[PDB]
Amino acid sequence: PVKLKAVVYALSPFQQKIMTGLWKDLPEKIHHKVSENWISATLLVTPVVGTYWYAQYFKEQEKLEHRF
């Protein structure tokens, strides 16, 4: 057991609003999600999308070359 020194105040679940917090400070939530994860989203989407488009470009050139 860890020795702990702390004071905790808690409110009853039936004395507070339950769902309205979902759509509170929404602009801040979106800004935090975008600004912290845009590098992570870039590192996942770019290799997948870039490789996919290169394959389609390769297939289109190969298909046209074999035509008469």
């Binding site: 020795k3 020194k5 004071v7 105040y9 409110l11 009853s12 039936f14």
Partner: protein, 48 residues
Amino acid sequence: EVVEQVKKLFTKLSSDPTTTSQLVANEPASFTGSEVRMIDDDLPLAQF
């Protein structure tokens, strides 16, 4: 003897008629479900 002494000595009291019932109705007390936990592992006994 107490009554005669009281009406002679208590003559400077305030005469404001504001009842305590009125004060209670103006600032009512209500119960809120909640809790406060003061965690101190150095105390030998728990008191709640």
